[PDB]
PDB file of C-alpha atoms in Angstrom:
ATOM      1  CA  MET A   5      17.177   0.424 -38.549  1.00 13.92           C
ATOM      2  CA  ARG A   6      17.735  -2.195 -41.745  1.00 14.47           C
ATOM      3  CA  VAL A   7      17.499  -5.858 -41.855  1.00 10.86           C
ATOM      4  CA  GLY A   8      20.541  -7.392 -40.682  1.00 11.06           C
ATOM      5  CA  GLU A   9      21.433  -4.656 -38.502  1.00 14.30           C
ATOM      6  CA  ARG A  10      22.739  -5.617 -35.016  1.00 15.82           C
ATOM      7  CA  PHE A  11      21.666  -3.862 -31.612  1.00 14.60           C
ATOM      8  CA  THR A  12      23.784  -4.849 -28.538  1.00 11.83           C
ATOM      9  CA  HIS A  13      22.856  -4.461 -24.666  1.00 12.54           C
ATOM     10  CA  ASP A  14      25.300  -5.198 -21.703  1.00 12.20           C
ATOM     11  CA  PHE A  15      24.145  -6.341 -18.219  1.00 10.96           C
ATOM     12  CA  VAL A  16      25.785  -7.371 -14.991  1.00  7.36           C
ATOM     13  CA  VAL A  17      23.732 -10.163 -13.339  1.00  9.55           C
ATOM     14  CA  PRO A  18      23.086  -9.033  -9.899  1.00  6.93           C
ATOM     15  CA  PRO A  19      22.151 -11.709  -6.825  1.00  4.25           C
ATOM     16  CA  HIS A  20      18.186 -10.633  -7.131  1.00  2.00           C
ATOM     17  CA  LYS A  21      17.900 -11.905 -10.720  1.00  3.08           C
ATOM     18  CA  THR A  22      18.083 -15.498  -9.875  1.00  3.94           C
ATOM     19  CA  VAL A  23      15.389 -18.240 -10.209  1.00  3.81           C
ATOM     20  CA  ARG A  24      14.152 -17.769  -6.436  1.00  3.95           C
ATOM     21  CA  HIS A  25      13.625 -13.840  -7.149  1.00  2.00           C
ATOM     22  CA  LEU A  26      11.466 -14.535 -10.116  1.00  2.39           C
ATOM     23  CA  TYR A  27       8.707 -16.151  -8.244  1.00  2.00           C
ATOM     24  CA  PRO A  28       9.505 -15.400  -4.486  1.00  2.00           C
ATOM     25  CA  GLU A  29       5.969 -17.031  -3.772  1.00  2.00           C
ATOM     26  CA  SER A  30       7.072 -20.660  -5.304  1.00  2.00           C
ATOM     27  CA  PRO A  31       7.981 -23.202  -2.502  1.00  2.00           C
ATOM     28  CA  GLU A  32       9.448 -25.363  -5.292  1.00  2.00           C
ATOM     29  CA  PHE A  33      11.717 -22.318  -6.795  1.00  2.00           C
ATOM     30  CA  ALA A  34      13.079 -21.416  -3.000  1.00  2.00           C
ATOM     31  CA  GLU A  35      15.614 -23.961  -2.706  1.00  2.00           C
ATOM     32  CA  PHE A  36      17.059 -23.581  -6.314  1.00  2.00           C
ATOM     33  CA  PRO A  37      20.273 -22.817  -7.578  1.00  2.61           C
ATOM     34  CA  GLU A  38      21.374 -19.192  -7.433  1.00  3.99           C
ATOM     35  CA  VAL A  39      21.368 -18.644 -11.331  1.00  6.64           C
ATOM     36  CA  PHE A  40      19.852 -16.102 -13.826  1.00 12.91           C
ATOM     37  CA  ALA A  41      16.211 -17.366 -14.536  1.00 13.68           C
ATOM     38  CA  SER A  42      14.992 -17.740 -17.915  1.00 13.61           C
ATOM     39  CA  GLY A  43      12.291 -15.743 -17.491  1.00 14.79           C
ATOM     40  CA  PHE A  44      14.847 -12.467 -16.471  1.00 13.37           C
ATOM     41  CA  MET A  45      16.828 -13.711 -19.988  1.00 11.10           C
ATOM     42  CA  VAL A  46      13.798 -13.282 -22.224  1.00  7.59           C
ATOM     43  CA  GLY A  47      12.864 -10.119 -20.255  1.00  5.65           C
ATOM     44  CA  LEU A  48      16.469  -8.927 -21.056  1.00  7.09           C
ATOM     45  CA  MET A  49      16.198 -10.031 -24.783  1.00 11.58           C
ATOM     46  CA  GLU A  50      12.862  -8.066 -25.088  1.00 11.52           C
ATOM     47  CA  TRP A  51      14.532  -5.191 -23.370  1.00  9.80           C
ATOM     48  CA  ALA A  52      17.156  -5.246 -26.102  1.00 12.04           C
ATOM     49  CA  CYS A  53      14.566  -5.453 -28.985  1.00 11.33           C
ATOM     50  CA  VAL A  54      12.381  -2.610 -27.290  1.00 10.57           C
ATOM     51  CA  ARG A  55      15.606  -0.176 -27.290  1.00  9.17           C
ATOM     52  CA  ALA A  56      16.595  -1.237 -30.963  1.00  2.65           C
ATOM     53  CA  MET A  57      13.074  -0.321 -32.211  1.00  2.00           C
ATOM     54  CA  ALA A  58      12.671   2.863 -30.285  1.00  2.73           C
ATOM     55  CA  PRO A  59      13.292   4.926 -33.340  1.00  3.09           C
ATOM     56  CA  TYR A  60      10.326   3.310 -34.925  1.00  3.22           C
ATOM     57  CA  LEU A  61       7.783   4.778 -32.582  1.00  2.00           C
ATOM     58  CA  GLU A  62       5.248   7.454 -33.089  1.00  2.18           C
ATOM     59  CA  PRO A  63       4.092   9.158 -30.262  1.00  2.00           C
ATOM     60  CA  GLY A  64       1.605   7.496 -28.146  1.00  2.00           C
ATOM     61  CA  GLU A  65       2.563   4.385 -29.513  1.00  2.00           C
ATOM     62  CA  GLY A  66       4.394   1.401 -27.430  1.00  2.00           C
ATOM     63  CA  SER A  67       4.926  -2.192 -28.203  1.00  2.00           C
ATOM     64  CA  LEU A  68       3.908  -5.646 -26.843  1.00  2.00           C
ATOM     65  CA  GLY A  69       6.068  -8.779 -27.191  1.00  2.00           C
ATOM     66  CA  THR A  70       3.946 -11.397 -29.322  1.00  2.00           C
ATOM     67  CA  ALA A  71       6.462 -14.785 -29.351  1.00  2.00           C
ATOM     68  CA  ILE A  72       9.491 -15.544 -28.006  1.00  2.00           C
ATOM     69  CA  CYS A  73      11.273 -18.697 -29.441  1.00  2.00           C
ATOM     70  CA  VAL A  74      14.577 -19.327 -27.530  1.00  2.00           C
ATOM     71  CA  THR A  75      17.173 -22.046 -26.210  1.00  2.00           C
ATOM     72  CA  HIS A  76      18.757 -21.730 -22.602  1.00  2.00           C
ATOM     73  CA  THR A  77      21.743 -23.757 -23.181  1.00  2.00           C
ATOM     74  CA  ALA A  78      24.284 -22.957 -20.429  1.00  2.00           C
ATOM     75  CA  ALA A  79      24.158 -21.237 -16.813  1.00  2.00           C
ATOM     76  CA  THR A  80      25.002 -17.871 -15.383  1.00  2.00           C
ATOM     77  CA  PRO A  81      25.925 -16.778 -11.783  1.00  2.00           C
ATOM     78  CA  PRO A  82      25.652 -13.254 -10.643  1.00  2.00           C
ATOM     79  CA  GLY A  83      28.621 -11.213 -11.383  1.00  2.00           C
ATOM     80  CA  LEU A  84      29.170 -12.166 -14.960  1.00  2.00           C
ATOM     81  CA  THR A  85      27.970  -9.638 -17.575  1.00  2.00           C
ATOM     82  CA  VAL A  86      25.034 -10.795 -20.296  1.00  2.00           C
ATOM     83  CA  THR A  87      25.522  -9.498 -23.462  1.00  2.00           C
ATOM     84  CA  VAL A  88      22.344  -9.877 -25.897  1.00  2.00           C
ATOM     85  CA  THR A  89      22.744  -9.144 -29.563  1.00  2.00           C
ATOM     86  CA  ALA A  90      19.610  -8.267 -31.140  1.00  2.00           C
ATOM     87  CA  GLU A  91      19.466  -9.001 -35.327  1.00  2.00           C
ATOM     88  CA  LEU A  92      16.641  -7.393 -37.028  1.00  2.00           C
ATOM     89  CA  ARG A  93      14.855  -9.876 -39.219  1.00  2.00           C
ATOM     90  CA  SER A  94      11.780  -8.022 -40.925  1.00  2.00           C
ATOM     91  CA  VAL A  95       9.751  -4.749 -40.209  1.00  2.00           C
ATOM     92  CA  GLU A  96       6.086  -5.110 -41.650  1.00  2.00           C
ATOM     93  CA  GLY A  97       3.653  -2.375 -40.618  1.00  2.00           C
ATOM     94  CA  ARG A  98       3.375  -2.910 -36.777  1.00  2.00           C
ATOM     95  CA  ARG A  99       4.989  -6.126 -37.055  1.00  2.00           C
ATOM     96  CA  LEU A 100       8.840  -6.577 -36.033  1.00  2.00           C
ATOM     97  CA  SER A 101      10.800  -9.449 -35.562  1.00  2.00           C
ATOM     98  CA  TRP A 102      14.426 -10.203 -34.547  1.00  2.00           C
ATOM     99  CA  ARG A 103      16.776 -13.041 -34.303  1.00  2.00           C
ATOM    100  CA  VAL A 104      18.083 -12.703 -30.447  1.00  2.00           C
ATOM    101  CA  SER A 105      21.369 -14.318 -28.689  1.00  2.00           C
ATOM    102  CA  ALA A 106      23.040 -13.869 -25.495  1.00  2.00           C
ATOM    103  CA  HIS A 107      26.514 -15.001 -24.223  1.00  2.00           C
ATOM    104  CA  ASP A 108      27.584 -14.277 -20.307  1.00  2.00           C
ATOM    105  CA  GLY A 109      31.521 -13.737 -21.117  1.00  2.00           C
ATOM    106  CA  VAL A 110      32.187 -17.853 -20.646  1.00  2.00           C
ATOM    107  CA  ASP A 111      29.214 -19.227 -22.876  1.00  2.00           C
ATOM    108  CA  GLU A 112      26.672 -18.901 -25.234  1.00  2.00           C
ATOM    109  CA  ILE A 113      23.971 -18.881 -23.241  1.00  2.00           C
ATOM    110  CA  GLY A 114      20.981 -19.106 -25.487  1.00  2.00           C
ATOM    111  CA  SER A 115      19.411 -18.098 -28.611  1.00  2.00           C
ATOM    112  CA  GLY A 116      16.155 -17.970 -31.001  1.00  2.00           C
ATOM    113  CA  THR A 117      13.749 -15.279 -32.338  1.00  2.00           C
ATOM    114  CA  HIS A 118      11.470 -12.539 -30.896  1.00  2.00           C
ATOM    115  CA  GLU A 119       8.390 -10.995 -32.422  1.00  2.00           C
ATOM    116  CA  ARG A 120       6.719  -7.460 -31.333  1.00  2.00           C
ATOM    117  CA  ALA A 121       3.788  -5.554 -32.484  1.00  2.00           C
ATOM    118  CA  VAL A 122       3.334  -1.957 -32.285  1.00  2.00           C
ATOM    119  CA  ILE A 123       0.443  -0.535 -30.040  1.00  2.00           C
ATOM    120  CA  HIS A 124      -1.463   2.565 -29.508  1.00  2.00           C
ATOM    121  CA  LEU A 125      -0.792   2.914 -25.905  1.00  2.00           C
ATOM    122  CA  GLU A 126      -4.275   4.364 -24.848  1.00  2.00           C
ATOM    123  CA  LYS A 127      -6.498   2.202 -26.904  1.00  2.00           C
ATOM    124  CA  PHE A 128      -4.692  -0.498 -25.438  1.00  2.00           C
ATOM    125  CA  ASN A 129      -5.021   0.453 -21.921  1.00  2.00           C
ATOM    126  CA  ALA A 130      -8.934   0.946 -22.232  1.00  2.00           C
ATOM    127  CA  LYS A 131      -8.715  -2.499 -23.869  1.00  2.00           C
ATOM    128  CA  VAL A 132      -7.104  -3.688 -20.614  1.00  2.00           C
ATOM    129  CA  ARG A 133      -9.356  -1.924 -18.129  1.00  2.00           C
ATOM    130  CA  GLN A 134     -12.264  -3.453 -19.951  1.00  2.00           C
ATOM    131  CA  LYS A 135     -10.935  -7.109 -18.436  1.00  2.00           C
ATOM    132  CA  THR A 136     -10.165  -5.861 -15.138  1.00  2.00           C
ATOM    133  CA  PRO A 137     -12.205  -7.189 -12.342  1.00  2.00           C
TER     134      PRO A 137
ATOM    135  CA  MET B   5       5.359 -39.987 -16.270  1.00  2.00           C
ATOM    136  CA  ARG B   6       2.720 -40.743 -18.479  1.00  2.00           C
ATOM    137  CA  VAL B   7       2.847 -39.179 -21.713  1.00  2.00           C
ATOM    138  CA  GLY B   8      -0.585 -37.340 -22.941  1.00  2.00           C
ATOM    139  CA  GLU B   9      -1.204 -36.181 -19.040  1.00  2.00           C
ATOM    140  CA  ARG B  10      -2.506 -32.749 -18.526  1.00  2.00           C
ATOM    141  CA  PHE B  11      -1.855 -31.074 -15.361  1.00  2.00           C
ATOM    142  CA  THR B  12      -3.249 -27.625 -14.326  1.00  2.00           C
ATOM    143  CA  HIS B  13      -1.653 -24.661 -12.283  1.00  2.00           C
ATOM    144  CA  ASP B  14      -3.716 -21.770 -11.308  1.00  2.00           C
ATOM    145  CA  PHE B  15      -2.322 -18.271 -10.201  1.00  2.00           C
ATOM    146  CA  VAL B  16      -4.139 -14.940  -9.237  1.00  2.00           C
ATOM    147  CA  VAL B  17      -1.707 -12.182 -11.078  1.00  2.00           C
ATOM    148  CA  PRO B  18      -0.725 -10.134  -8.292  1.00  2.00           C
ATOM    149  CA  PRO B  19       0.207  -6.070  -8.705  1.00  2.00           C
ATOM    150  CA  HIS B  20       3.913  -7.117  -8.567  1.00  2.00           C
ATOM    151  CA  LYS B  21       4.054  -9.101 -11.695  1.00  2.00           C
ATOM    152  CA  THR B  22       3.310  -6.213 -14.218  1.00  2.00           C
ATOM    153  CA  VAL B  23       6.114  -5.414 -16.935  1.00  2.00           C
ATOM    154  CA  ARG B  24       7.704  -2.882 -14.919  1.00  2.00           C
ATOM    155  CA  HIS B  25       8.414  -5.463 -11.804  1.00  2.00           C
ATOM    156  CA  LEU B  26      10.284  -7.532 -13.860  1.00  2.00           C
ATOM    157  CA  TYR B  27      13.215  -5.227 -14.496  1.00  2.00           C
ATOM    158  CA  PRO B  28      12.824  -2.015 -12.371  1.00  2.00           C
ATOM    159  CA  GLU B  29      16.401  -0.858 -13.489  1.00  2.00           C
ATOM    160  CA  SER B  30      15.018  -0.699 -16.861  1.00  2.00           C
ATOM    161  CA  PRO B  31      13.633   2.738 -17.858  1.00  2.00           C
ATOM    162  CA  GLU B  32      11.719   1.763 -21.278  1.00  2.00           C
ATOM    163  CA  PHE B  33       9.991  -0.984 -18.959  1.00  2.00           C
ATOM    164  CA  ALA B  34       8.747   1.703 -16.260  1.00  2.00           C
ATOM    165  CA  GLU B  35       6.384   3.221 -18.822  1.00  2.00           C
ATOM    166  CA  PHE B  36       4.673  -0.168 -19.941  1.00  2.00           C
ATOM    167  CA  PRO B  37       0.953  -0.871 -19.365  1.00  2.00           C
ATOM    168  CA  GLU B  38       0.464  -2.785 -16.302  1.00  2.00           C
ATOM    169  CA  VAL B  39      -0.097  -5.966 -17.755  1.00  2.00           C
ATOM    170  CA  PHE B  40       1.630  -9.830 -16.897  1.00  2.00           C
ATOM    171  CA  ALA B  41       4.723  -9.956 -18.291  1.00  2.00           C
ATOM    172  CA  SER B  42       6.271 -12.207 -20.676  1.00  2.00           C
ATOM    173  CA  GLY B  43       9.112 -13.284 -18.891  1.00  2.00           C
ATOM    174  CA  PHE B  44       6.841 -13.757 -15.612  1.00  2.00           C
ATOM    175  CA  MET B  45       4.532 -16.034 -18.089  1.00  2.00           C
ATOM    176  CA  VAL B  46       7.479 -18.145 -18.820  1.00  2.00           C
ATOM    177  CA  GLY B  47       8.483 -18.562 -15.608  1.00  2.00           C
ATOM    178  CA  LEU B  48       4.573 -19.846 -14.675  1.00  2.00           C
ATOM    179  CA  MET B  49       4.831 -22.133 -17.385  1.00  2.00           C
ATOM    180  CA  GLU B  50       8.411 -23.801 -15.764  1.00  2.00           C
ATOM    181  CA  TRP B  51       6.653 -23.660 -12.312  1.00  2.00           C
ATOM    182  CA  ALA B  52       3.652 -25.707 -13.638  1.00  2.00           C
ATOM    183  CA  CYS B  53       6.167 -28.421 -15.657  1.00  2.00           C
ATOM    184  CA  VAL B  54       8.214 -28.379 -11.989  1.00  2.00           C
ATOM    185  CA  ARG B  55       5.361 -28.997 -10.101  1.00  2.00           C
ATOM    186  CA  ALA B  56       3.917 -31.558 -12.928  1.00  2.00           C
ATOM    187  CA  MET B  57       7.861 -33.796 -12.777  1.00  2.00           C
ATOM    188  CA  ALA B  58       8.080 -33.457  -8.843  1.00  2.00           C
ATOM    189  CA  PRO B  59       6.918 -37.183  -7.759  1.00  2.00           C
ATOM    190  CA  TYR B  60       9.047 -38.763 -10.550  1.00  2.00           C
ATOM    191  CA  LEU B  61      12.327 -37.197  -9.570  1.00  2.00           C
ATOM    192  CA  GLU B  62      14.595 -39.105  -7.133  1.00  2.00           C
ATOM    193  CA  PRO B  63      15.925 -37.264  -3.952  1.00  2.00           C
ATOM    194  CA  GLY B  64      18.389 -34.350  -4.553  1.00  2.00           C
ATOM    195  CA  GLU B  65      17.362 -34.010  -8.259  1.00  2.00           C
ATOM    196  CA  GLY B  66      15.654 -31.100  -9.862  1.00  2.00           C
ATOM    197  CA  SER B  67      15.519 -29.860 -13.310  1.00  2.00           C
ATOM    198  CA  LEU B  68      16.246 -26.541 -15.609  1.00  2.00           C
ATOM    199  CA  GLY B  69      14.483 -24.881 -18.723  1.00  2.00           C
ATOM    200  CA  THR B  70      16.079 -25.574 -21.639  1.00  2.00           C
ATOM    201  CA  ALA B  71      14.005 -24.177 -24.524  1.00  2.00           C
ATOM    202  CA  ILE B  72      10.663 -22.657 -24.628  1.00  2.00           C
ATOM    203  CA  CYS B  73       8.764 -21.400 -27.770  1.00  2.00           C
ATOM    204  CA  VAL B  74       5.559 -19.891 -27.165  1.00  2.00           C
ATOM    205  CA  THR B  75       2.821 -17.075 -28.513  1.00  2.00           C
ATOM    206  CA  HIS B  76       1.632 -14.156 -25.885  1.00  2.00           C
ATOM    207  CA  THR B  77      -1.484 -13.570 -27.397  1.00  2.00           C
ATOM    208  CA  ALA B  78      -3.557 -11.194 -25.120  1.00  2.00           C
ATOM    209  CA  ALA B  79      -3.113  -9.193 -22.097  1.00  2.00           C
ATOM    210  CA  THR B  80      -3.665  -9.682 -18.766  1.00  2.00           C
ATOM    211  CA  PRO B  81      -4.542  -7.031 -15.787  1.00  2.00           C
ATOM    212  CA  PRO B  82      -3.658  -8.094 -11.787  1.00  2.00           C
ATOM    213  CA  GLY B  83      -6.775  -9.347 -10.331  1.00  2.00           C
ATOM    214  CA  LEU B  84      -7.298 -12.336 -13.155  1.00  2.00           C
ATOM    215  CA  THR B  85      -6.481 -16.267 -12.464  1.00  2.00           C
ATOM    216  CA  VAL B  86      -3.912 -17.398 -15.129  1.00  2.00           C
ATOM    217  CA  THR B  87      -4.224 -20.973 -15.723  1.00  2.00           C
ATOM    218  CA  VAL B  88      -1.487 -23.045 -17.276  1.00  2.00           C
ATOM    219  CA  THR B  89      -2.045 -26.526 -18.727  1.00  2.00           C
ATOM    220  CA  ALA B  90       0.808 -28.311 -19.432  1.00  2.00           C
ATOM    221  CA  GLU B  91       0.619 -31.610 -21.451  1.00  2.00           C
ATOM    222  CA  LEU B  92       3.748 -34.186 -21.388  1.00  2.00           C
ATOM    223  CA  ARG B  93       4.859 -35.272 -24.697  1.00  2.00           C
ATOM    224  CA  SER B  94       7.697 -37.291 -23.907  1.00  2.00           C
ATOM    225  CA  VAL B  95      10.656 -38.414 -21.790  1.00  2.00           C
ATOM    226  CA  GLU B  96      13.878 -39.763 -22.983  1.00  2.00           C
ATOM    227  CA  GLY B  97      16.384 -39.955 -20.333  1.00  2.00           C
ATOM    228  CA  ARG B  98      17.162 -36.531 -18.611  1.00  2.00           C
ATOM    229  CA  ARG B  99      15.174 -34.623 -21.080  1.00  2.00           C
ATOM    230  CA  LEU B 100      11.196 -33.991 -20.731  1.00  2.00           C
ATOM    231  CA  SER B 101       9.146 -32.350 -23.648  1.00  2.00           C
ATOM    232  CA  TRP B 102       6.302 -30.627 -23.026  1.00  2.00           C
ATOM    233  CA  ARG B 103       3.084 -28.955 -24.777  1.00  2.00           C
ATOM    234  CA  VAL B 104       1.964 -25.821 -22.796  1.00  2.00           C
ATOM    235  CA  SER B 105      -0.661 -23.306 -23.207  1.00  2.00           C
ATOM    236  CA  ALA B 106      -2.430 -20.244 -20.752  1.00  2.00           C
ATOM    237  CA  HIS B 107      -5.677 -18.765 -20.210  1.00  2.00           C
ATOM    238  CA  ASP B 108      -6.870 -15.722 -18.053  1.00  2.00           C
ATOM    239  CA  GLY B 109     -10.474 -16.602 -17.757  1.00  2.00           C
ATOM    240  CA  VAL B 110     -11.366 -14.456 -20.400  1.00  2.00           C
ATOM    241  CA  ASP B 111      -8.692 -15.077 -23.288  1.00  2.00           C
ATOM    242  CA  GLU B 112      -6.121 -17.922 -24.164  1.00  2.00           C
ATOM    243  CA  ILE B 113      -2.964 -15.789 -23.912  1.00  2.00           C
ATOM    244  CA  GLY B 114      -0.317 -18.222 -25.216  1.00  2.00           C
ATOM    245  CA  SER B 115       0.598 -21.836 -26.178  1.00  2.00           C
ATOM    246  CA  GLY B 116       3.854 -23.392 -27.497  1.00  2.00           C
ATOM    247  CA  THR B 117       6.135 -26.154 -26.417  1.00  2.00           C
ATOM    248  CA  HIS B 118       8.409 -26.471 -23.548  1.00  2.00           C
ATOM    249  CA  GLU B 119      11.462 -28.632 -22.700  1.00  2.00           C
ATOM    250  CA  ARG B 120      13.593 -29.616 -19.424  1.00  2.00           C
ATOM    251  CA  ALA B 121      16.423 -31.490 -18.215  1.00  2.00           C
ATOM    252  CA  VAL B 122      16.600 -33.280 -14.862  1.00  2.00           C
ATOM    253  CA  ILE B 123      20.196 -32.260 -13.176  1.00  2.00           C
ATOM    254  CA  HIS B 124      21.612 -33.685  -9.597  1.00  2.00           C
ATOM    255  CA  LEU B 125      21.205 -30.332  -7.800  1.00  2.00           C
ATOM    256  CA  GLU B 126      24.442 -30.362  -5.545  1.00  2.00           C
ATOM    257  CA  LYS B 127      26.482 -31.376  -8.382  1.00  2.00           C
ATOM    258  CA  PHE B 128      24.995 -28.432 -10.764  1.00  2.00           C
ATOM    259  CA  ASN B 129      25.231 -25.965  -7.768  1.00  2.00           C
ATOM    260  CA  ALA B 130      28.949 -26.910  -7.376  1.00  2.00           C
ATOM    261  CA  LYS B 131      29.796 -26.697 -11.021  1.00  2.00           C
ATOM    262  CA  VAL B 132      27.826 -23.527 -11.583  1.00  2.00           C
ATOM    263  CA  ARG B 133      29.340 -22.048  -8.485  1.00  2.00           C
ATOM    264  CA  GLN B 134      32.959 -22.302 -10.006  1.00  2.00           C
ATOM    265  CA  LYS B 135      32.180 -20.023 -13.229  1.00  2.00           C
ATOM    266  CA  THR B 136      30.885 -17.280 -10.444  1.00  2.00           C
ATOM    267  CA  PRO B 137      33.654 -14.119 -10.500  1.00  2.00           C
TER     268      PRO B 137
END
């Protein structure tokens, strides 16, 4: 796990990762073209970093995404394979960051940075329970 | 559209918008805290901008998210109302730029910037359909 080290994650886009499936509650997204939603792209980018940093975790710890800063530069219909490359940028204590990039076999589809913080799973949950209605 | 206008968009987070629901095919996300996913927050910020932009589009037009750059600073359980405030920064031809911010009624949860591009829906669908395998 060294600064500049690369991790790669591949994913064939299925029909149910398009805009309309991100928010089936949204009339505005219902009649939208059948392309990979930016929110699922983000999720897939975060998922590549979660897998890259798994060696760093102590038992009882997990992680939260704390920033995402990316472009989304071409569209992807179902059937193409999206490859995410996550390049470790910094590791300082609980704080990690990556440069992320994604390509669907035809175009580069976007790139930027993602930041994560290591959490104590049980402390964090009690914290969320406290703000639960 | 007028620069500096604020639009707000309220959403009661349901059980199906937590992390594990974003990628049910990810074993990593399966074990995450039951909290609103960053990818779902990105889609919510987009929805708010789409609603704001709607009455200034011509018939046949929609839009795409081209960039997002935001923090995610506090976590949100199902049952809270997430309010996105989106403020128009600029309009230049097909490009609209936005300052966005989100709060769950308890904490500020994130803020930063979003960019969109106006598209002709039929033309874009046709072109995307032609990179489909």
